[PDB]
Each structure stands twice: as structure tokens, then as C-alpha cells.
Design a protein around this ligand. Structure first.
Ligand SMILES: CC(C)(COP(=O)(O)OP(=O)(O)OC[C@H]1O[C@@H](n2cnc3c(N)ncnc32)[C@H](O)[C@@H]1OP(=O)(O)O)[C@@H](O)C(=O)NCCC(=O)NCCSC(=O)C[C@@](O)(CC(=O)O)C(=O)O
Ligand SMILES: CC(C)(COP(=O)(O)OP(=O)(O)OC[C@H]1O[C@@H](n2cnc3c(N)ncnc32)[C@H](O)[C@@H]1OP(=O)(O)O)[C@@H](O)C(=O)NCCC(=O)NCCS
Ligand SMILES: Nc1ncnc2c1ncn2[C@@H]1O[C@H](COP(=O)(O)OP(=O)(O)O)[C@@H](O)[C@H]1O
Lengths: 1032, 89, 178
């Protein structure tokens, strides 16, 4: 929305970014003074204020500060330093609120008179920007709206000189008229390109020296921060006047800025008992209003909500914040946590509910001593477990619980908590039964919900014709029509979607706040689309102005941004409207009714679905227009659309604080444009009875909830006293229309059934399926990667290497450091042995054939087996088989000789005696000096001593050494039993050791051949002996 | 990734992206390679080899795990397969 | 399905002992539908000398504070009911007890096999009379047990010894995917 900024930021952006021919001195000249700064620093780095006089101002968002006396005029530097003693450091009460004063501002004083003082302001409006100029500046302005000269600039246009010359500035001196004709134009361009909403110079001094600004009121579009990141630097958004925000409130504000989910919290007095943390903005407004209706006018303490589908962590942190606030007091009467919320459309109730229940699970101590009891009423996606597991969480923890769902009134919990209730050319038709829509963006669940709603409504064809997703090519995606498969086309570009589907009348825009504007402008270039639903929230108001203007001049209706959409039972559904099929069947939204409603909130729209379903024959059409300053369509538009609709017989409206739209309803029913019965209720009655309400922007007493409620009550609109009996009046009007015979209720017809999605039934614990696979080495589902029971951070912090990770992944054991180092050494010595071997030869042949790395390395590896690369495993196997038997090395040699079988692991072409193989030497020395016991190594060494007497080169080569040392490591490191070590040898762990070691060499060979740019290889014919049959 | 996390919080630098950019930096700044050598090694698939050699350990661990659990011959369930065959062709 | 139908997933306040298994389900149903629930129900098997007699489990229930009512079914043969009456005479059993003995047919039928009654002072009618003027609420037969049992419940909620805990939904057992 629009947030006010400090005078420093407004002035700095003005001086840095203004582009006008007028001379603007005092540029970059101001001083922010605080009690916690060194005066020498300010007076040294910024000494320019010594030359002239000075003006001191308060700097914490006070309006009309001239009358309060805090404006200092004509004070010298010493006088300024002395003037702060009796005001700074304590309260300063203005109007009704009070607050501290700990940050003020310093300006150069300028000599001026009333002849030079001017007033200028530019502020936002739906039709554009009102720019007002006023002649007499100072504290004599009084009324400005009906006194200053009025001029309007439309949406997406520039200001011509003529309007300023002879329509905006006609009561000013001529030369100063000429200079202002350019200064004000520059100010307006600065207004536009910086995305301001309210910009007020009061007053403005214009002089031959230049232009002087004294007080600046700036409210800027916060949601435009993504488009004005460079233009703003590090902008500040000061809180309003009052008690300073608590650190936990700042934490909640930071949490809101972490993600797109909405998280609001505000406090009045932590000493109260009635505490509320319900879901949904408008729903929070309704519960807060009901608290103060029936005896909680001053006892209510907090004011907050969560929405936008907060995740597990968002509700985690919010619940712990409210609990930390919960414990820091003692109320003798008692304490209650009252938490409701309407039936959520898209917010996963299960996740937030897990957050709150697990935040109360671990936080149990300081809650039971304060005598707190919880009254809960929640509905939405997966509420069944939300009314189930809290039932025993609160029972085992030792807190009285009262958990209800949808069947009870949304507002009855408030009465129960205090004992008041005993505890038990735009078109008038947008959607039809045969309308089709294009969904912009990849929203599989939303489209599936649309299709399910279409199926239970007995629609002939699904309401989704095509999907647009720019980041993938054209294809078709599977979806479910009832129990069968259908295909919905997904296109990279929208032009093809509109070309190949000319029957599409609606577009649901799921683009983000950064891509929604361009998508909607591209859509409105196509005349077949009559309705556009914009789901994204956070679009800046100027871009929404442009969307609204384009839609109005194209005749396309916009279901305003920041909305869940709307639902027409029996015909069409916008995205996630009405929740999922559980709510659709629960609220009987599969058949047309007789009541059409309109609302801002998307959660209150779903609550209205519930109310109208259970107190009336049902809903005919419901639309949520979105919680933005300028919705694409307003209340009055949809009320006219309903009045012009013969099928609609009742109107229901949920109004809000601010805006004269309900007054438009009033004059609509005054002169006879609206004749059908209209039940309207405006929420936000606590705005005029609380300290300060952020969630809108009411300006006077003609925009509050009570004023709207009375103006509608004595106009012909059935207005309830509160939300308590809104449903009762809906019932009364419905019965009045039934008795009068205007409406005949149609008896219920069962809807077609829909098979339940397997994924959704798996999230409810309704299905058991056996697991076809077992794994033990790595778990990656959780937050942290786990290597056989050990997190990756634990792996890295204790200085494991390739060897330790290898031990975890292959053996699921914590090998000692020497074992891991030995495994790494084994990988090092077997890394490569030249290109002549079979595997390296195959890798080089495949690499020179132009194949990729995987294919070449694969072709090399596939030769690893018995004759090549299997000497490690064979040597280990036969040496272990000999050692396990009692035969001595001499008998082992004789036995192998008798069977005509060479000893695997014995033999070398060179390196006979006194020139030993060096890899063998390194590995053997390491195994000597680190291993605790090497029985099989000693056995193999005795065998080698025997064989190096038959022939000098019959030494224990690297394969036999690695095999016997690996068997010794398995059998003696202490992490394996005998059978586990034997089993790992049997299944081929040493095969894996050799393969992993030699994969490095094969990849190196592939890279070498690629780098040398070796051509395709063909074996020479002279190296091949052709012996073919004569004619066989 | 600062920009993308401003768009959506989970749009962080992956393991893949981090390893790729850090490997390119290591090639370009360790002092052992000229610019053309580093580009050549990136082009011919050094990082493909890095991933393959890393994941070979995990694949061999999976093989040893399946062997040690005595898992039998696998056949995919017919319910997970959608048979869409021509009628006569 | 039977557990949910008789709401046997949560602790109760009633405990019963018998031999037959079908009556155990039937009495679970009757108590759960006419009383806050069953704290424990046991069948000991209709043999000559079951491993544990009625009085062992009755005294076990008496020692456990969780049980507030005892419900007992008798049978032809055995002096167990008279021994229970003897135990309850002096006040060894103080919590309310309701017992009905089946097998009056042995007094009014030609022959009964399904036991081994010896005298007319051991059969079902005599045991019922002894329990009736022995401190135990005994109806005429199985027919009206309902208003005899539920009544005892509304007795002990009138005295305030039993505080009714409202039901909490239990987690449901997932069904087979196939
Ligand atoms: C619209 C949206 C989906 C937001 O869109 P998303 O950002 O999620 O998805 P993306 O379009 O992908 O945007 C990400 C950007 O990063 C780009 N990107 C992706 N991957 C990238 C990569 N690897 N590298 C580089 N870039 C990459 C991507 O290209 C894009 O770039 P760009 O387009 O330029 O921005 C969602 O937020 C929203 O608004 N509504 C959701 C549905 C809905 O109907 N809700 C209404 C419910 S009523 C309610 O709330 C009240 C209540 O709660 C009441 C109660 O509870 O009581 C209830 O329940 O009713
Ligand atoms: C097809 C094509 C490769 C012909 O190449 P070429 O150089 O004319 O003939 P070769 O590549 O077979 O090699 C030429 C000589 O090498 C000899 N040679 C081929 N294989 C040999 C081997 N394994 N050992 C020894 N000599 C060999 C041939 O006998 C031939 O003998 P010559 O010197 O007497 O002519 C060439 O025309 C071409 O690249 N065309 C593109 C079309 C294509 O790619 N077709 C695919 C082939 S099916
Ligand atoms: N630099 C200045 N020099 C002298 N007077 C000033 C100066 N700035 C403000 N004032 C006084 O403030 C009054 C106008 O108030 P204005 O700035 O329009 O709103 P606010 O009272 O909120 O500051 C004038 O009467 C003027 O005397």
C-alpha cells in the first residue's frame, strides 16, 4: 500500500531527482539531529549551517505542528542546542495520542513573506492525480479540499503547459507564474517516475533567489519498491505517532517481508485478557469488531492475522511470538486465546495448524500458570485434523480447549468466551455453464480444482481450455475429468492460445506482481476476452490505474487484483475460490441459488458461501473484488450486474473502512436503479474506537464503518447490528421472498461424485501402500541431506574426506580416520595405469569417436571384470579363503600349484628385489604404521617370501596388497563383524574400489583425447589376421 | 540470486549453480590455467566429469545396499503404466 | 469398524468380566451407547476352571481408581456368584455393581447342555436372587439392562464422582490402496 516517509527521504529524492529549469538552492542542505549522535561529527562533516540562521522541526510524523508550537523559527546554533531541553526526552500529547521525541530535523532559515508562500499538493485518485495549488501558505490554509484550485491529470498522460498556465496558476504573480509553470511540471514528473501517492509542499517559497521548501508530506507506493529499487536507495518507512513498536512487532514485520504471505500484528495494551490471532485480514477485522461489540471494548489487547498461505515456519514464528507475549503478565481473572478464521480458500490449514500445535507442544511451562483457555474455530483445506489433533494436544498439555468447526457460527466463539452464549460497454453476464477460460501460468492444482468443480456441477465440458506458461514449450498436460484422463494444452505464448481457442471468454491471470501488468495488457489487446481475473497482490496502484483505464476503454471487466476470484455455482469458478471440493460439497456450491454477494476479502467470500448455503437455498454468484486501493471492478459494478440479472433475487455486500462505494449503493437505491433486496454490512467499526487502525485509509468521519452502516440502514438496506446476526437477516429476507412467491426453491439433486486424488488422500492418512523399494545409504527428503544417518554438515565439520563419505555410503559405518585415509590412498594408487590397458583403450576409442564423457567412461568401465581389474577382488578372496583355513603359506602355495592356478596378487613384470614396486611400498608402509592388526597382510607377506624364492619378481603386487589390506581393514577396524566383512567382500566392495579409482583415470583419458583433438580411430588392417571360411 | 530471492524466497543458488560458478572461478583464478585453457576445460565437460565421479560413489553405494538387502527382481506395477495402443494398426 | 461403532478408542469408566466373547462385544455396544464408555472389558473363556476367576478381575477393578462401575454376567454352574456376594457383604467391594446371571432355562427347560449345575440353589435364578438382595442391581432378564445401567451412570454424575469428558475424534486407520 501507500506508506508515509520521513522528510529527509522526501527532500533527498526531491533534490537528487527533480528535473526543472527553476533554480533550487538549499539542495543537499539539512541535518538530522538525534540525542545519540556526536555534535562535533555533524558540525564538522556538515558545517554549512554556521553561515546563516536555522529552523528546527520535529521529525516523527506530526501534522499541524505549527499550532502545537514545536516549530522553531529564528534560532541560532547555541539557541537551537539550548531549545531542546524542555521538550525532547519526554511525551508530547497531541489530539488523543502521545509519544516520545527523539529525532528532529534542521534546515537553513530563509527570509520570506506571505507574498512568496505558496501551497502545492499532488495526491492519488482512481481517475488519476489531483494537483491542488493554494495561494496563502502557512497555518491560515484551513480547509484545502474546497479552497485550493482543482486540476486533474488522467491515467498515463503528461501535463501540457497550458493547464498550468491558465487553469492551475491564475492567482499568482506573473514572473513567479512563469517559474512555477516549469517547477510544478518538474515536481509532477518527479511524482510520476518515483511512484509517489501523496506529495505536499506546505508551504512553498518562490523567489528570485530560487525555491524554498519548509515542510514536506510524502506518502509513497511501497509495493513499487521492486521497480524503484535504484531510485530509492535505502528508504525508511517510519511508524505513525504513538507508542514505539515493540522489538517482537518489528520481528513480525520482518517476517512479513520475508515472503509473500501476509503477517500482521499490532498491540494496544498487553495487560488485557482477550487475545486474538485468527487467520485472514477481513476475518480478523470481523472478530475484532465482534470482541468490542458485546463487552470487550477495552479488554481486547492484540490485533493481527496471518494469510497468503503461511508456511510451517511463518506460523511457527508467529505462534512463538504471541506465546512469548502471552507469558509476560499475570491476570487474576484469567486469560483466553480466542482463535477463529473463516473457511480458507487456499491457505493450507494443516500446515499453519501444525505450526501452532507444535509451538504449543514445546512451549508448555509458562502457559498453565496464567490460567489460559483456548476457544478455536477453524475451517478450510484439511480442517478435520485441525479439529482432531488439537483435541488431544490441549487435553494432554493441560489446557481447557473448545474446538469447533464450520457448523458453528464464525462469530459465536466471541459470545461463548465471555459467557454471553452457553457452551454446547461492460456485460451483465460474465460466467455461463459453457464459458471457457485460459489460465496464465503453471497452476496445476488450481486448474484441477476448476475441473473438479466443473464435474460436480454437471458441466458438459471443462472450463479450462488452455494454459499459458512461457518457460516451457508447447505441450499437453494430463488432468482429471471425474475419474478419466483428459489433456489440456499448455502453450509458450498467449497468441497461439487465443488463435487456436476462439471460444475462450475469460482469462485467469496467475502471473506474479511483476508480470501481471504486462500479461493483462497483452490480454486486453485481444477482443474475445471479456473477463480477466488478476490473482497477484502487490501490484502498484499506478499500474492498476493503467489496467483499469485500458479495461474501461476496451469494455473488459477486471476482477480486481489481490483476489481469490469469484464463484458462480453450477457454471464457473475462479481458481482457488471456495476452497477445494470438500467445501464445494459442504457449502452446496455445485448448484445455483438465489443470492448474489460481493466482498473485498477472499476468506470472507468463503464465509459468505457458508452462511448463505446454510441459511438460504444457496449462492447464485459470488465475487471477491480484491483488497486493493483501486479494484478493477468495485462493489457498485457487481451490484448493477446482479440487479440486471433476472436469476439474482438477493444482494449481499461486505463493505470496508473507507471509500464511498457503499454511498454509491445508497444513491443507487435512492433514485430506483436498485430494486432487489440488499443486505449490506460494513466491517471495521473499531476504527473510531481503537487507538489506531492500519487495516482502507479513512480520512474523515464520513468513511468509517458505523457511518456507512447507518447511511445504508436508513436508505432501504437491511443492515445487521453486527456480524452476529447477519445470517439471521439473510434468513429473514430469504423467507420473505419465499412467502411472497417470487422465488421457488428447487429441491436438491445429488451431484456427480469425484474420485479423491491419491496425493490429497495421502496428506490425510486415508491410504496405505506397501513400499516397493528399500534404501539405506542416503536420505534426502528432509531438510538436511543425510549420508547413512549422518547429516552433511556433520560429515564436513569432522574433517571427513572422500574416504569417510565412501565408508558412510558403502558400509553405513563410521570408519576410523586411518581407514578413510587408506581408502583414499587405494583410490589414488588405482587412479590410472596408462592408456595401454583394455579399459583406457576402450575409453580413448570411444572418445575419439566423438561420444560424450558418460559414454566414453562407460565403454571403458565395461571392460572391468575378471581379466582386467578383477585382480583386487580375486586376490582378496583367495587369500582370505586360504587364511580362514588352517593351511600355512607353504601349503597354500603347494595347493595352488597343484590345481594349476596362479596366485592372484603375486607377480610383476619388473620390480623383483631391491627395487620394489613403489605403490606397494607406500600402501604397505601405511598399513604397517596405522592399522592395529594385519593378520592377512602377514599371511600374504609370508606367501610373498615363499614366491620370491621361486622367481625374484613374484612379489606382492598392488592388486594383492590392496585386496589383503582391505580385508584386514574390514576385519580389524572394529566397525564390522566377521560376517559383515565377509559379506562385503563377497558382494564386490573391492570391485567398487577399483572401479571408482579407475573412473578418474578414464575421465582423464577422455578429457585428454578431447583436448588433443584426436580424430576417429580405425584399427590398421595389417594388425588383424583374417581367417574366414572358404564358403561356409 | 539476491535478485531472484527478492522475486521468490526459494530462488537461491543451487548446489549445481554454486559448484559450477566456483569451479569456473577456481579454473580462472588459481593461477594454473590461462583463460583459453579454463574455457577449454569447461567446454569439453570437466564439470560433467566432476558430477559423474561424485555420483559414481553414490551409485556403487546403492548397488551394495541392494545386494546386501537381498532385494529380488523388480517388475513395475501395471497400475502405474498407461497402455495407449492403436486399435488395429 | 466395531471399535469406532462402540467408541473403544478412549479411556472410560466401566469395566466388565465374563467368559463368552460375543456378549463382550454386545455389552461394549450397550455400555458405550448408554454410558460414557467402557474402561475395560474382559472375557476369560467358558471352560471348567479359567485362568482368572471373576473376583480376581473385580478386585483388580476395585483397586484401580479408573473403574467406577462393575458389570457382571453369570452362567449356570459354579458358586462364583455366591462368593462374589460373600465378598461384597462385608464391604470389600464398595463401587456400584450391576450383575445379571443368564441360564434360567436350566430351571424351565427339558435339558440344558451349554455349566454342569448341581443343585437348585446354584442355578441362575438363585444367583440372581442372591445378587438382588445382596447389594447388586439385578433386572428380571437381559431385556431392560439399558435403563438399569445408564441409570447407574446418571447416579454417579448426580453425585459428581464421574466428570464426563466429551469425545475427541481419533485418527482414522488408512485403508488398502488396492
Ligand atoms: C500468483 C502467485 C502464484 C505468485 O506467483 P509465484 O511467485 O508463486 O510463481 P512465479 O510466477 O513463478 O514467480 C516467481 C518468479 O521467479 C521466476 N523463476 C522461477 N524459477 C526461476 C529460476 N529457476 N530461475 C530464475 N527465475 C525463476 C519466475 O519466472 C517469476 O518471475 P516473474 O514473473 O518475473 O516475477 C501467488 O503468490 C498468489 O498471489 N496467489 C496464489 C493462489 C491464490 O489464488 N491465493 C488466493 C487465496 S485467498 C487468501 O489468501 C485469504 C485466506 O488466506 C484467508 C484465510 O486463510 O483465513 C484464504 O485462504 O482464502
Ligand atoms: C566416405 C569417405 C570417408 C571416404 O573416405 P576416403 O578417404 O575416400 O577413404 P577412407 O576414409 O576409407 O580411407 C582411404 C584409404 O584408407 C584405407 N583404409 C581404410 N581402413 C583401413 C584400415 N583399418 N587399415 C588400413 N587402411 C585402411 C582404405 O583402403 C583407403 O585406401 P586408399 O588409400 O587406397 O584409398 C569420405 O568420402 C567422406 O567423408 N564422405 C562423407 C560421407 C560419409 O561420411 N559417409 C560415411 C561412410 S559409410
Ligand atoms: N523555515 C521557516 N522559517 C520560518 N517559518 C517557518 C519555516 N518553516 C515553517 N514555518 C512556519 O510554519 C507555518 C506553516 O506550517 P507548515 O510548514 O505549512 O505546516 P507544519 O505546521 O506542519 O510545519 C508558518 O506559519 C511558518 O511561520
Amino acid at each position: 500500500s501507500a506508506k508515509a516517509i520521513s522528510e529527509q527521504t522526501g527532500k533527498e529524492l526531491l533534490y537528487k531527482f527533480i528535473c526543472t529549469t527553476s533554480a533550487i538552492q538549499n539542495r543537499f542542505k539539512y541535518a538530522r539531529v538525534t540525542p545519540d549522535t556526536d555534535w562535533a561529527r555533524l558540525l564538522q562533516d556538515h558545517p554549512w549551517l554556521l553561515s546563516q540562521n536555522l529552523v528546527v522541526k520535529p521529525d516523527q510524523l506530526i501534522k499541524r505542528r505549527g499550532k502545537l508550537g514545536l516549530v522553531g523559527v529564528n534560532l541560532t546554533l547555541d539557541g537551537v542546542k539550548s531549545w531542546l531541553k524542555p521538550r525532547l526526552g519526554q511525551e508530547a500529547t497531541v489530539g488523543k495520542a502521545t509519544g516520545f521525541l527523539k529525532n528532529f530535523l534542521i534546515e537553513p532559515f530563509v527570509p520570506h513573506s506571505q507574498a512568496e508562500e505558496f501551497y502545492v499538493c499532488i495526491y492519488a485518485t482512481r481517475e488519476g492525480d489531483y494537483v491542488l495549488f493554494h495561494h496563502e501558505g502557512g497555518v491560515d490554509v484551513g480547509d484545502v479540499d474546497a479552497k485550493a484550485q482543482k486540476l486533474l491529470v488522467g491515467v498515463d498522460e503528461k501535463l501540457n503547459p497550458e493547464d498550468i498556465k491558465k487553469h492551475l496558476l491564475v492567482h499568482a504573480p506573473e514572473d513567479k507564474k512563469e517559474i512555477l509553470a516549469s517547477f510544478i511540471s518538474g515536481l509532477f514528473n518527479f511524482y510520476e517516475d518515483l511512484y509517489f501517492t501523496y506529495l505536499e509542499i506546505n508551504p512553498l517559497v518562490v523567489t528570485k533567489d530560487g525555491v524554498y521548501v519548509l515542510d514536506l508530506a510524502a506518502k509513497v507506493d511501497a509495493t513499487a519498491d521492486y521497480i524503484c529499487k535504484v531510485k530509492w536507495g535505502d528508504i525508511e518507512f517510519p511508524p505513525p505517532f504513538g507508542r514505539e513498536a515493540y522489538p517482537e512487532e518489528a520481528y513480525i514485520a520482518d517476517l512479513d517481508a520475508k515472503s509473500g504471505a501476509s503477517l500482521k500484528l499490532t498491540l494496544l495494551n498487553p495487560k488485557g485478557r482477550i487475545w486474538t490471532m485468527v487467520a485472514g485480514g477481513g476475518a480478523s477485522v470481523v472478530y475484532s469488531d465482534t470482541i468490542c461489540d458485546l463487552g470487550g471494548v477495552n479488554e481486547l489487547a492484540n490485533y493481527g492475522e496471518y494469510s497468503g498461505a503461511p508456511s510451517e515456519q511463518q506460523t511457527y514464528d508467529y505462534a512463538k511470538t504471541i506465546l512469548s507475549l502471552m507469558t509476560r503478565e499475570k491476570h487474576p481473572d484469567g486469560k483466553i486465546l480466542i482463535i477463529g478464521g473463516s473457511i480458507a480458500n487456499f491457505t493450507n490449514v494443516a500446515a499453519t495448524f501444525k505450526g501452532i500445535v507444535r509451538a504449543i507442544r514445546d512451549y508448555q511451562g509458562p502457559l498453565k500458570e496464567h490460567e489460559v483457555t483456548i476457544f478455536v474455530r477453524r475451517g478450510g483445506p484439511n480442517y478435520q485434523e485441525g479439529l482432531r489433533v488439537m483435541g488431544e494436544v490441549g487435553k494432554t498439555t493441560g489446557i481447557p480447549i473448545h474446538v469447533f468447526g464450520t457448523e458453528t457460527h464464525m462469530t459465536a466463539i466471541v459470545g461463548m468466551a465471555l459467557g454471553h452464549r452457553p457452551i454446547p460497454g461492460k456485460s451483465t453476464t460474465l460466467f455461463s455453464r459453457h464459458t471457457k477460460a485460459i489460465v496464465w501460468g503453471m497452476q496445476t492444482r488450481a486448474v484441477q480444482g476448476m475441473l473438479d468443480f466443473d464435474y460436480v456441477c454437471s458441466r458438459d465440458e471443462p472450463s479450462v481450455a488452455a494454459m499459458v506458461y512461457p518457460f516451457t514449450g508447447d505441450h499437453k498436460q494430463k488432468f482429471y475429468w471425474g475419474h478419466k484422463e483428459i489433456l489440456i494444452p499448455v502453450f509458450k505464448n498467449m497468441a497461439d492460445a487465443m488463435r487456436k481457442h476462439p471460444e475462450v471468454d475469460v482469462l485467469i491471470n496467475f502471473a506474479s506482481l511483476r508480470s501481471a501488468y504486462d500479461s493483462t495488457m497483452e490480454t486486453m489487446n485481444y477482443a474475445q476476452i471479456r473477463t480477466i481475473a488478476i490473482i497477484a497482490e502487490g501490484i502498484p496502484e499506478a499500474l492498476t490505474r493503467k489496467l483499469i483505464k485500458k479495461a474501461d476503454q476496451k469494455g473488459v471487466t477486471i476482477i480486481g487484483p489481490a483476489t481469490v476470484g469469484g464463484i458462480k455455482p453450477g457454471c464457473f469458478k475462479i481458481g482457488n475460490t471456495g476452497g477445494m471440493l470438500d467445501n464445494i460439497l459442504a457449502s452446496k456450491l455445485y448448484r445455483p441459488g438465489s443470492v448474489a454477494y460481493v466482498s473485498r476479502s477472499g476468506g470472507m467470500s468463503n464465509e459468505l458461501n457458508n452462511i448463505i448455503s446454510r441459511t438460504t437455498d444457496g449462492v447464485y454468484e459470488g465475487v471477491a473484488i480484491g483488497g486493493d486501493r483501486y479494484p478493477g471492478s468495485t462493489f457498485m459494478d457487481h451490484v448493477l450486474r446482479y440487479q440486471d440479472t433476472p436469476g439474482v433475487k438477493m444482494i449481499v455486500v461486505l463493505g470496508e473502512i473507507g471509500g464511498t462505494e457503499e454511498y454509491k449503493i445508497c444513491r443507487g437505491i435512492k433514485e430506483g436503479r436498485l430494486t432487489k433486496p440488499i443486505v449490506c454490512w460494513c466491517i471495521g467499526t473499531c476504527a473510531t474506537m481503537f487507538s489506531s487502525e492500519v487495516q482502507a485509509c479513512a480520512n474523515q468521519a464520513s468513511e468509517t464503518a458505523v457511518a456507512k452502516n447507518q447511511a445504508l440502514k436508513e436508505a432501504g438496506v437491511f443492515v445487521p447490528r453486527s456480524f452476529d446476526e447477519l445470517g439471521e437477516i439473510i434468513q429473514s429476507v430469504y423467507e420473505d421472498l419465499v412467502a411472497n412467491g417470487v422465488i421457488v426453491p428447487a429441491q436438491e439433486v445429488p451431484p456427480p461424485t469425484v474420485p479423491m486424488d491419491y496425493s490429497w488422500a495421502r496428506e490425510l492418512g486415508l491410504i496405505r501402500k506397501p513400499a516397493s523399494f528399500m534404501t539405506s545409504i542416503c536420505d534426502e527428503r528432509g531438510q538436511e541431506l543425510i549420508y547413512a544417518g549422518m547429516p552433511i554438515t556433520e560429515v564436513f565439520k569432522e574433517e571427513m574426506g572422500i574416504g569417510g563419505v565412501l565408508g558412510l555410503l558403502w558400509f553405513q559405518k563410521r570408519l576410523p580416520k586411518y581407514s578413510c585415509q587408506f581408502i583414499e590412498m587405494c583410490l589414488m594408487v588405482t587412479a590410472d595405469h596408462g592408456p595401454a590397458v583394455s579399459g583406457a583403450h576402450n575409453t580413448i576409442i570411444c572418445a575419439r569417436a566423438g561420444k560424450d564423457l558418460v559414454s566414453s567412461l562407460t565403454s571403458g568401465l565395461l571392460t572391468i571384470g575378471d581379466r582386467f581389474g578383477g585382480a583386487l577382488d580375486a586376490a582378496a578372496k583367495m587369500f582370505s579363503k586360504a587364511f580362514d583355513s588352517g593351511i600355512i603359506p607353504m601349503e597354500f602355495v603347494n595347493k595352488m600349484k597343484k590345481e594349476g592356478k596362479l596366485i592372484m596378487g603375486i607377480g610383476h613384470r619388473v620390480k623383483s628385489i631391491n627395487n620394489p614396486d613403489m605403490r606397494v611400498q607406500i600402501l604397505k608402509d601405511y598399513v604397517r604404521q596405522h592399522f592395529p592388526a594385519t593378520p592377512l597382510l602377514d599371511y600374504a607377506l609370508e606367501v610373498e617370501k615363499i614366491t620370491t624364492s621361486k622367481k625374484p619378481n613374484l612379489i606382492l603386487n598392488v592388486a594383492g596388497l590392496i585386496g589383503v589390506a582391505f580385508v584386514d581393514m574390514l576385519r580389524n577396524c572394529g566397525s564390522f563383524t566377521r560376517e559383515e566383512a565377509d559379506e562385503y567382500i563377497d558382494i564386490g566392495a573391492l570391485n567398487g574400489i577399483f572401479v571408482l579409482g579407475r573412473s578418474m583415470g578414464f575421465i582423464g583419458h577422455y578429457l585428454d583425447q578431447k583436448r588433443l583433438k584426436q580424430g576417429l580411430y580405425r584399427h590398421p588392417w595389417d594388425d588383424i589376421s583374417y581367417v574366414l571360411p572358404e564358403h561356409m
